[PDB]
Design a protein around this ligand. Sequence first.
Ligand code: BCL
Ligand SMILES: COC(C)(C)C/C=C/C(C)=C/C=C/C(C)=C/C=C/C(C)=C/C=C/C=C(C)/C=C/C=C(\C)CC/C=C(\C)CCC=C(C)C
Ligand SMILES: COC(C)(C)C/C=C/C(C)=C/C=C/C(C)=C/C=C/C(C)=C/C=C/C=C(C)/C=C/C=C(\C)CC/C=C(\C)CCC=C(C)C
Ligand SMILES: COC(C)(C)C/C=C/C(C)=C/C=C/C(C)=C/C=C/C(C)=C/C=C/C=C(C)/C=C/C=C(\C)CC/C=C(\C)CCC=C(C)C
Ligand SMILES: COC(C)(C)C/C=C/C(C)=C/C=C/C(C)=C/C=C/C(C)=C/C=C/C=C(C)/C=C/C=C(\C)CC/C=C(\C)CCC=C(C)C
Ligand SMILES: COC(C)(C)C/C=C/C(C)=C/C=C/C(C)=C/C=C/C(C)=C/C=C/C=C(C)/C=C/C=C(\C)CC/C=C(\C)CCC=C(C)C
Ligand SMILES: COC(C)(C)C/C=C/C(C)=C/C=C/C(C)=C/C=C/C(C)=C/C=C\C=C(C)\C=C\C=C(/C)CC/C=C(\C)CCC=C(C)C
Ligand SMILES: [Fe+2]
Lengths: 52, 52, 44, 44, 43, 44, 43, 48, 48, 54, 55, 307, 281, 258
Amino acid sequence: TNLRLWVAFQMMKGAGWAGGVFFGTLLLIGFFRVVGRMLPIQENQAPAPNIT
Amino acid sequence: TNLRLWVAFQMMKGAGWAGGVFFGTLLLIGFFRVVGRMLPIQENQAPAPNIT
Amino acid sequence: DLGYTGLTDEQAQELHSVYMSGLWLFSAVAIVAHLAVYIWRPWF
Amino acid sequence: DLGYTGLTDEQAQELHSVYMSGLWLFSAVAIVAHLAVYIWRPWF
Amino acid sequence: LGYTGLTDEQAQELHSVYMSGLWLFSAVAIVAHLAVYIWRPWF
Amino acid sequence: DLGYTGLTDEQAQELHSVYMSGLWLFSAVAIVAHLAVYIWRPWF
Amino acid sequence: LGYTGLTDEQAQELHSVYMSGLWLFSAVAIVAHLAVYIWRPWF
Amino acid sequence: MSKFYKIWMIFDPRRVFVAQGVFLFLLAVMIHLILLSTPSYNWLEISA
Amino acid sequence: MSKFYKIWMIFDPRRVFVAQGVFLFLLAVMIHLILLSTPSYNWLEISA
Amino acid sequence: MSKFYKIWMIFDPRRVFVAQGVFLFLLAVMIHLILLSTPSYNWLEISAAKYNRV
Amino acid sequence: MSKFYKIWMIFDPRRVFVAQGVFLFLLAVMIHLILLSTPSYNWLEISAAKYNRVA
Amino acid sequence: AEYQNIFSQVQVRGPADLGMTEDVNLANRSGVGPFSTLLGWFGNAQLGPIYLGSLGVLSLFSGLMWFFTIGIWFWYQAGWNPAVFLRDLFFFSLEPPAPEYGLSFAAPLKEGGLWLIASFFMFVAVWSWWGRTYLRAQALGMGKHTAWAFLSAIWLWMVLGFIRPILMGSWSEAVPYGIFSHLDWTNNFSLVHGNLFYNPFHGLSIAFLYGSALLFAMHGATILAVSRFGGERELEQIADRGTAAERAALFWRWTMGFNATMEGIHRWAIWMAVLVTLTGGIGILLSGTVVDNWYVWGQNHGMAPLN
Amino acid sequence: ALLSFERKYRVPGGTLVGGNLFDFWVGPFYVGFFGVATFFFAALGIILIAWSAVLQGTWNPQLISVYPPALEYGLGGAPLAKGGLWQIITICATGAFVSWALREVEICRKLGIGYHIPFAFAFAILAYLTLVLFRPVMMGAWGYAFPYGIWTHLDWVSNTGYTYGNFHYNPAHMIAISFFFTNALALALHGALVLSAANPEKGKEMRTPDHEDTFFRDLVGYSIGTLGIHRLGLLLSLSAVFFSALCMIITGTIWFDQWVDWWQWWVKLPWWANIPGGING
Amino acid sequence: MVGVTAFGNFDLASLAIYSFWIFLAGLIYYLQTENMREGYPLENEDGTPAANQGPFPLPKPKTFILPHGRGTLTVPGPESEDRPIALARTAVSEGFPHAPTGDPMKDGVGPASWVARRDLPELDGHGHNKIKPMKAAAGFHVSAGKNPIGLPVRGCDLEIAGKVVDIWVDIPEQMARFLEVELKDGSTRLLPMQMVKVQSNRVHVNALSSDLFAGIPTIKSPTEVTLLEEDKICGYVAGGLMYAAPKRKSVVAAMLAE
Ligand code: BCL
Ligand SMILES: COC(C)(C)C/C=C/C(C)=C/C=C/C(C)=C/C=C/C(C)=C/C=C/C=C(C)/C=C/C=C(\C)CC/C=C(\C)CCC=C(C)C
Ligand SMILES: COC(C)(C)C/C=C/C(C)=C/C=C/C(C)=C/C=C/C(C)=C/C=C/C=C(C)/C=C/C=C(\C)CC/C=C(\C)CCC=C(C)C
Ligand SMILES: COC(C)(C)C/C=C/C(C)=C/C=C/C(C)=C/C=C/C(C)=C/C=C/C=C(C)/C=C/C=C(\C)CC/C=C(\C)CCC=C(C)C
Ligand SMILES: COC(C)(C)C/C=C/C(C)=C/C=C/C(C)=C/C=C/C(C)=C/C=C/C=C(C)/C=C/C=C(\C)CC/C=C(\C)CCC=C(C)C
Ligand SMILES: COC(C)(C)C/C=C/C(C)=C/C=C/C(C)=C/C=C/C(C)=C/C=C/C=C(C)/C=C/C=C(\C)CC/C=C(\C)CCC=C(C)C
Ligand SMILES: COC(C)(C)C/C=C/C(C)=C/C=C/C(C)=C/C=C/C(C)=C/C=C\C=C(C)\C=C\C=C(/C)CC/C=C(\C)CCC=C(C)C
Ligand SMILES: [Fe+2]
C-alpha cells in the first residue's frame, strides 16, 4: 500500500491504454502500407484526384 | 479476481520490466550517439585500432 | 502431491488450462504473423 | 468540506503532495530534455 | 535410499510425466529434423 | 565399509546397477552413432 | 599411521578394487596402443 | 496555491490519474509527430 | 501431456509467469534484432 | 532402463528443471548460431541469394 | 571389475552425476567443435560442396 | 540513500594516542602533531608521532640530498628563473649519461655526471628506509611482512635504475629524474624492445596490478559492507570470529564458490601486490638482455598471428 | 558442502526477482533469478568464443580473437563470421556482468550486508561498457572496440594508445595510474601490516590494532586506521576505474591530436609563454 | 643471451615464464590452504561431515597466542555453533533455504544471526576497554559534523521511538561506534553508528521500525559492551533490513515487497 506507486500505477495504466490504441492504429496503417507496397501501385498509379 | 487477467498481468509485468530495461539501454546508446554526432568526430576520426 | 508450492491439484489444473489457452492464443497469432512475413518475404 | 468524492481533507493533502512531487519530477526531466534539444538544435 | 524425500511411487509418477514431456519434445525435434533434411540435407 | 557418503552396500549395488544400465545405454547409442559416421565417412 | 582413518582391511579391499580399475584401464590402453601401432607405428 | 489539494475532494483521484496518463501520452505523441512533420527537427531523417 | 498441470505444484505460478514474460519479450527482441542485422528482412531499410 | 525413475530419488525436480531449462535453451541457441555463421544453412542468406534480394 | 559399485561409498552420487553431466556435455561439445574446425569432417561444409550450395 | 560508511558522519577527538612501547626507543620518537578534521572524515585525524633513528636519519639525509640535487639541476635548467621553473617543472629532467660513456663514471657533470650523484643519494635513501621498515617491525615485535613486501618494490626499482643498466653496460638505459622524462623513458622502453605488451612478465604484472585493484575493491567493499557488524576490526575477527567474518565469508562463498578467512584474505592481499613488482623486475630484466623484440618473441611463442 | 557456520544464514527472502522460484543453492553457489541469467550468458558467451575459434581456423587459445565488426559496418549488424559473433558475445558479456552484479545484490539482502560490493562491481562494468559500448557509439563504429582475444586486445590498447602519440600524457590517465599504483601500494602495506600483527615473531603474542597504528606512525608518522584503510581501498580502486573510464571516453571524442600537444597550454600561459630559457623556448 | 635457445623456441625468457607458472600454481595452492583454517571441515545441512571436502587438503594447524592472556587459538580446529539454530529444513534435498521456526530476529537466524564470541569486552593494546561511552571516556568530545546527542530517533516506519543520549567511542581508533538511544520505557539501547544516518534534525534508522526498537538486545554493563553483546546488537539491527520490510514505508521497499 504505497501511495507513490498507486498514483504512478494509475497514470501508467492510462498511458498504457493510450499506447496500445496508438500502437494498434499504427499497426493498421503499417499493414495497409505493406499491402500497397506489395501490390503493383507504383508501376501504374492514378493521377491526383484533387488540385494540389 | 479473474484468473485469465491475473496470469496476463504477471506476464505483462515481466514484459514491462524487460521493456523498460531494454528501452533504458537504448536511451543510453542513443544519448552517446547524439553526443558523438554533435562532437566533431566525423571531421577528424581515428583509424581502425584493430585489423578488420 | 509433492506440494512444493502448496497449490492443490485442482488449482494446478485450473491454472494450467488458463496458461495453455493463452499459449495457444499466443501461438495462433505468431503463426499468422509468420504467414504474413512468409507471404511478404519467404525465407525458404 | 463539499465531499463530492468522499475523501477527507487529510487524504486530499497527502495525495496532492504525492501528485505535486511527481509533477515536479516530471517537470524536471522535461526541462533537461528541452535543454538537451536546445543545445542540439535551438528553436529560437 | 532417500535424498529428495520422494517416495518410490512419487518418483515413478514424476518420471512418467517427465518422460511424456521428453518424447513430446523429441517428436517435434524429429519432425523438425525431417523438415530440414528434406529442405536441405546435411549428408 | 568406508561409508563416506552414508550409502549402505545394498544401496550402492542398486545405484550402481541403474548407473551401469544408463552407461550401457549411453555407450550403445554412441556405438551406433560411431557406426553411422564410420560408414558415412571413415577416419581410418 | 592412520591419517586417512580407514583400517588395513579396508585399505586392502580398496586397493584390490583400485587395482582392478587400474588393470582394466591398462588393458584397454594396451589394446588401444596395439591398434594404433598396427595402424601407424611410431618406431 | 495552498488549497489546490481540495481539488481531490472535487474530482476522484484515481479517475483523474488514469485520464491524466492518457492526456500526457497523447500530448507527448502530438508534439513528437509535429516535430517529425517539419523538415528540420526530424531526427529520423537528419541522422541519415 | 495430461499431467503437465502438476508442474505448477513444482514451480510457483506467479513467479514463472513474470519470468516467462521477461523471457518472451527478450526472445522477441532477440529475433527482431537478428532480422535487422541481415541486409534483407530489414524492414526499416527496404521501405526507404 | 525401467529403473531410471530413481534419478528423482537423487535429484530434486526443482533444481533439475531449472538446470535442464537452461541447458536446452543454451543448446538450442548454440546450434542456431552455428548454422547462421556458416554460409550454407544460413537460411536468411539462402533465401536472399535464391530470390535475388540483393 | 565386480566391486566397482563401491565407488559410490567413496563418491557422493549427487556430485558425481552433476560432474559427469558437465563433463560429458563439455566433452561432447569439444569433439564436435574439433570436427567442425577441420575442412574434412565439417559436415556443414561437406554437404555444401557435395550438393553445390556455393553458387 | 542510506549511510554507506564511506565518510564518518561524526568525529570524536580524545587525547592523542602515543602508541605502543614494546621495544621502541621513545627518545627517537617525536611528539604528536596536529589533528586534521579533513583527514578525520575519512580516517584518523591525528598526525604523528614519527620515529627517527639512525636509519631514519640516513634515509632523510640521502632522501633530501636526492631531492635537493634534482632541484638544483632543475633550477640550472631553468636559468634560476622562478617563472621558468614553474613553467617547465614537469619538462625538466636529470638525464643519465650518454650511451657512449657506457658504465664509466667519466661523464661530464652536466652531461650525466650529476645524475650519478643524485642516483647514489636515492640508492642510499631507499635502502636505508627499507631497513627502517624492517627495524620498526622488529622493534614492535611484529612480522617482517612489510620489509619483504617492500623488497618486492625495491626489486623493480633496483632493476630499472641499477641492475638492468649494468647488464646493458650503459647508464643511458636507466631512468631520468623527471615527471615527463620518466614517462617518455617508459614509452621509449617499449618501442625499442618491440611492443613490451607482448612481454609475458609485463602481462603478469598487469594481471596482479589489475588484481590488486580488484582485490582491494573487493576487500574494501566487503569490510565496509560488514562494518555494521564491527567487521573493520579485522584483528579481533581473526582472534574471535564474529558474525561479520562469517557473512563476509558467506557472501563470497555464495558468489564465486570459494572464500577466504579474515587473516587469509590478507595473504592474498600481500601476494597480489608483491607479484606486481616481482614479475615486473623479471619482465624488465629480460628486455634487452634476453629479448630485443617481444613481438618477434611473441610470434615464435604463439602469441601473434604471424609465424 | 556447507561451512561449519553456514547453516544459520541460509534463509529465504532477499530476492529481487522470482521469489523462491530460483532461491536455492547449487553446491556453494547461490542461484537466484540472475544467476540463471548469469549461467546462460556465461555459457553462451564461452561457447561462441569456442565457435569463433572454429571459424577463425586456429585452436591456440592465445591466437583466438573475436574481432569486432569493421569500420564500414558502423554501428549496425555484421555477418557472424566477420564481426557479428563479437556483437553477440558482447551482448552475452554485458548480460553476464549485470546479472552477476544483481545476483550479488540478492546475496547482500539475504545476508543483510551493505551493497558496497555490487556497487564496486558496477564501476568495473561501466569501465567495460565504456570501451565496448560508450566509446564506439560516440565514434560511430563497433570497430573502435577491442577484440576478445588474450593478445589481440593488447594490440587494441597499443594501437589506440599510439593513435594519440604517447598516451601517458593523457591527464585523466595520469590520475588513474597514480590511483592504481597507490592502491597496490596500499594493498601491499595493508596486507603485510595485518599479517605482521597476526603472525608476529615466534612466541610473541598476536598483536592488537594499536600496534598496527603504532607501526605506521613510527614509519610515516600517520595511521589512517582500520576503517580508513578499507575506505581508502574502495575509493582508490573506484577512482582509478572512474578516471580510466573518463580517460578513454574523452579520447577520440573530445581530444584528437597527440596528448603531448595538450600540455603546451600550461607552457603557453600568458605570463610566461614568452620568457626565454628552460625547456620550451 | 639474446636469442639463445636451449631447444626449439625455449630460451631464458621461456624458462622464466614456465617456472613462474609452476610457482604461481604452487602459490595459489598455498594461499587457498591458508583460507581453509576457518569453517572447515565442511558439514551436511544436518551437521555431519560431508562426503565432499574439496580438492585442497586442510593445512597443518597453527596457533595464535591471543593478547592480554586471553589464551591461544589453534586453527584448523573443532568449531561448534554453541547455540540452538531455530531453523527448519524446507526440502529433504540439500541446497535449499531453511525457514525460521519462529521469530527470526529474536531467534538470531538469517540476517539477524550472531556468533557465540567470547563474552568479554574487547581490549586495546594497554588492556583497557576498547569501546567505552563518551561520558566515561576521558576528554573525548564531538569534533566535527552534526552532534547526534539529543536528536530524535526515527525508525523505518517514519515514527520517532526515542532520542540519542550517549555516544560510544572506540578509544584507540578514536571514532564513534554506537549510539545509545533511550527509548520511551526509560531504558537505553545501543545502535551501531554504521546503521544510522544522522540527518540535520533527526537520527533516521532505516533498519528498524519504531516498535522493533524495544527488541534490541541489552548490555549487561552500562560502562562496557562485550563481544557477544556487540554481535547480538549488530545482528538484530542488520536483521531488521529484511525482517521489517513489511513495516517500511519506502517506495523501493514496496516495490521489493512480497
Ligand atoms: C608505452 C608504454 C608501455 C609500457 C611500459 C612499461 C615499462 C617500461 C614498465 C612498465 C611497468 C608496469 N606497467 Mg606497463 N607499459 C605499457 C602499458 C601498460 C598498461 C596498459 C593498460 O596499457 C598497464 C596497466 C601497465 C601496467 C604496468 C604495471 C603493472 C608495471 C609497474 C608496476 C609499478 O607499480 O610500477 C611503479 C613502481 C615502482 C617502479 C616501484 C618503486 C619502488 C621504490 C622503492 C619507490 C621509491 C620512492 C622514491 C624514494 C620517492 C619517494 C617520494 C617521497 C615518498 C615523497 N602497462 C605500454 C605497453 N610498463 C614496469 C614493469 O615492471 O614492467 C614489467 C616497467 O618497468
Ligand atoms: C539463436 O536465436 C535465433 C533467433 C537465431 C533462433 C532462436 C532459437 C531459439 C532457441 C528459440 C526459442 C524458442 C522458445 C524456447 C520458445 C518458447 C515459447 C513458449 C513455450 C511460449 C509460451 C507462451 C505462453 C503464453 C504467452 C501464455 C499466456 C497466457 C496467458 C496470458 C493467460 C491466459 C489469459 C488470456 C488469454 C487473456 C489475456 C487478456 C487480455 C486482456 C488479452
Ligand atoms: C498545438 O500543439 C503544439 C504541439 C503545437 C503545442 C501544444 C500546446 C499545448 C496546448 C500544450 C499543452 C500543455 C499542457 C496542458 C501541459 C500540462 C502538463 C501537466 C500539468 C502535467 C502534469 C504531470 C504530472 C505528473 C506526471 C504527475 C505524476 C505523479 C506521480 C507519478 C505520483 C508520484 C510518484 C512518484 C514520483 C514515483 C514514481 C514511481 C517510480 C517507480 C518511478
Ligand atoms: C558443438 O556444438 C554442436 C551443437 C555443434 C554439437 C553439440 C552436441 C551436444 C553436446 C549435444 C547435446 C545433446 C543432449 C545431451 C541433449 C539433451 C536432450 C534431452 C535429454 C532433452 C530433454 C527434454 C525433456 C523435456 C523437454 C521434458 C519436459 C517435461 C515437461 C514439460 C513436464 C514437466 C513436469 C513434470 C515432471 C510435473 C511432475 C510433477 C509431479 C508432482 C508428478
Ligand atoms: C582433445 O582430445 C580429444 C577430444 C580429441 C580426444 C578425447 C580424449 C578424452 C580425454 C576422452 C575422454 C573420454 C571419457 C573419459 C569418457 C567417459 C565416459 C563415461 C564414463 C560416461 C558415463 C556415462 C554414464 C551415463 C550416461 C549414466 C547414466 C545413468 C542414468 C541416466 C541413470 C541414473 C539413475 C540412477 C543411478 C538411479 C539411482 C539409484 C537409486 C537406488 C537411488
Ligand atoms: C609432454 O609429455 C607427453 C604428454 C608427450 C608424454 C607424457 C608423459 C608423462 C608425464 C606421462 C605420465 C604418465 C602417468 C604418470 C600415468 C599414470 C597412470 C595411472 C597411475 C593411472 C591409473 C588408473 C587407475 C584407474 C582408472 C582406477 C580406477 C578405479 C576404479 C574404477 C575403481 C574405484 C572404486 C573403488 C576403489 C571402490 C572403493 C572401495 C572400497 C572398499 C570402499
Ligand atoms: C625549489 O625546490 C627545491 C630546490 C627546494 C627542491 C625541489 C626539488 C624537486 C623539484 C625535485 C623533483 C624531483 C623529481 C621530479 C623526481 C622524480 C623522480 C622519478 C619520477 C623517478 C623515477 C624513476 C627512478 C628510478 C627507477 C631510479 C632508480 C635509481 C636507482 C636504483 C639507484 C641507482 C644507483 C646508482 C646509479 C649508483 C651509482 C653511484 C655509484 C657511486 C656507484
Ligand atoms: Fe583488511
